[PDB]
Each structure stands twice: as structure tokens, then as C-alpha cells.
């Protein structure tokens, strides 16, 4: 069901984590993707944990959280202008769950690169109550 | 850190390899119009099998299954996926699996299982 955090807040948490990690990259670099994803995952976890936490600290952690982050390079032209256009490989990601339907949930964010950036980020957040 | 898998990993790898080949074993290449039914099939199979093989009494785990079908790059890398979590390090965990296609197959499958005790 409903997330512990308003989706509009989730969206700027996720967007900030992505630009914090890859905002200054000129290009996709397979050597750095692990650090980048670490970073994005770390940032989003800390932040959703903070904004979840009731002001009454006598309340213990109400949710478990998982963050999956994916970085995908854009297609690279054969040579390595016209209108900008991004080539992408096809992909499809879905999720199923055996859950408490009223307490548990997921939310997704995409960080679409322009042609000059050369890569996209996709983020999935899962919350499990209690 | 992570809790012990409620199903042996070697069993998982074969629940997963089997769910994948059932859904995409006969496909000749990546076909985007079929990927949703392909994933629908892959996820349902894996989920049903782990629910079944994890419990003796009531159900004691929550499960989440994520499946991603990824088209190969044209032949003569390009994507990285990772997961972090805030759970119970003694009971909860995750397992991942790559069904790696050869060149003729033109696509990979990436599966993740998450289990949460009680």
C-alpha cells in the first residue's frame, strides 16, 4: 500500500542521490559503476530511514528497506549531428512479492540521461513493515 | 551481513535456471513485445517454488522476486546492478542469479530473491 514517505519526497531523494553519484561523470565508466551504485544505494537508504523515523524515539524501526540500483550505458555509435537521439538496448524489469499487501510496497525511479551523458539510472525501493 | 537462505542456494539456482529456460528457452532472440509475459512467467514460477519449498505450520517468510530481461548489445560491460538493504542480518537476505545468454540467444536474465523472516 501507501509508502512511509510521500512519493514526491522520494523522487527528490532519489534524484539527489543519482546526481550526487554521477552528476559530474562525462561518460559511462564500467570501472566506477560499483562505487556509483554503492553510493546511490547508501544515500537513499539513510534518507528513507531518517524520514521514516517518528519524532518519538521510543518507537523502534518500523520498516525494513531494500534499494536496488542499476546503471545502464547508452548505445555507442559504430564510430565511437541532427537532432539528439539516445540509443538504448531493450530491457524489462518486473517484481512480484509474497507480502503483506496493506503494509509492504515498492517504488521506482528513473534517471534518464541525455545523449551527452551516455547512461541511465534506475532505482527500486522496497519497504517491508515491521 | 545476511541470514541463512531458507532454501539451499544450489536449489535456488536450479529453480531459477528452470524458470528462465521455461520462459525463454525456445526464443530465438530478444523480442520486446514478449518480455512482459516472459517476466510474468519467470517471476511466478520462482515465487511459487520458493513459497512451496520454504515451509514445512504457518508461513514464516516474506518473499520478493525481481526479474530483468536485458537485450544483448549487437556483436562486434554496459550495465551494473546492485542491492543494499536494512534488515535483520541474522534472518533476512538476498540471492541473485544471472541466466547468461550466448550470442545467438541475444539476451540475458537477471533474477533477485529477497527473503524477510516473519
Amino acid at each position: 500500500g501507501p509508502s512511509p514517505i510521500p512519493t514526491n519526497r522520494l523522487k527528490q531523494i532519489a534524484a539527489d542521490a543519482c546526481n550526487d553519484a554521477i552528476g559530474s561523470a562525462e561518460f559511462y565508466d564500467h570501472a566506477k559503476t560499483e562505487q556509483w551504485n554503492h553510493q546511490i544505494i547508501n544515500t537513499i537508504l539513510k534518507a528513507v530511514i531518517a524520514e521514516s523515523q517518528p519524532s518519538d524515539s521510543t518507537t523502534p524501526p518500523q520498516f525494513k528497506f531494500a534499494v536496488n540500483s542499476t546503471i545502464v550505458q547508452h548505445l555507442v555509435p559504430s564510430s565511437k549531428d541532427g537532432k539528439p537521439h539516445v540509443g538504448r538496448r531493450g530491457m524489462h524489469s518486473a517484481t512480484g512479492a509474497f507480502w503483506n499487501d496493506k503494509t509492504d510496497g515498492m517504488w521506482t525511479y528513473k534517471h534518464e540521461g541525455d545523449e551527452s551523458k551516455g547512461m541511465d539510472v534506475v532505482v527500486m525501493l522496497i519497504w517491508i513493515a515491521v | 551481513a545476511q541470514g541463512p537462505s531458507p532454501i539451499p542456494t544450489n536449489r535456488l539456482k536450479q529453480i531459477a535456471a528452470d524458470a528462465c529456460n521455461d520462459a525463454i528457452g525456445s526464443a530465438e532472440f530478444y523480442d520486446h513485445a514478449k518480455t512482459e509475459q516472459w517476466n510474468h512467467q519467470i517471476i511466478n514460477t520462482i515465487l511459487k517454488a520458493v513459497i512451496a519449498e520454504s515451509q514445512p505450520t504457518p508461513p514464516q517468510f516474506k518473499f520478493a522476486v525481481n526479474s530483468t530481461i536485458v537485450q544483448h548489445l549487437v556483436p562486434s560491460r554496459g550495465m551494473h546492478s546492485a542491492t543494499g538493504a536494512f534488515w535483520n542480518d541474522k534472518t533476512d537476505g538476498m540471492w541473485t542469479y544471472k541466466h547468461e545468454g550466448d550470442e545467438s540467444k541475444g539476451m540475458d536474465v537477471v533474477v533477485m530473491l529477497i527473503w524477510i523472516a516473519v
Partner: peptide, 29 residues
């Protein structure tokens, strides 16, 4: 208590790369 709910998505149809071509000088006559 705990059940099997509907499935959800992230999705990206394949899209061709923008190729970069090689050009001659160009002849004005």
C-alpha cells in the same frame, strides 16, 4: 495475513543508436 499480489514494472523498448557518418570535403562547381 501475507498474500501474493499483482506484479509491477520498469520498461525500455530497444532504440537504435544515432550513427555518426563520414563526410567528404564537398565540391562546388
Amino acid at each position: 495475513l501475507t498474500t501474493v499480489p499483482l506484479t509491477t514494472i520498469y520498461e525500455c523498448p530497444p532504440s537504435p543508436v544515432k550513427e555518426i557518418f563520414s563526410y567528404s570535403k564537398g565540391i562546388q562547381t
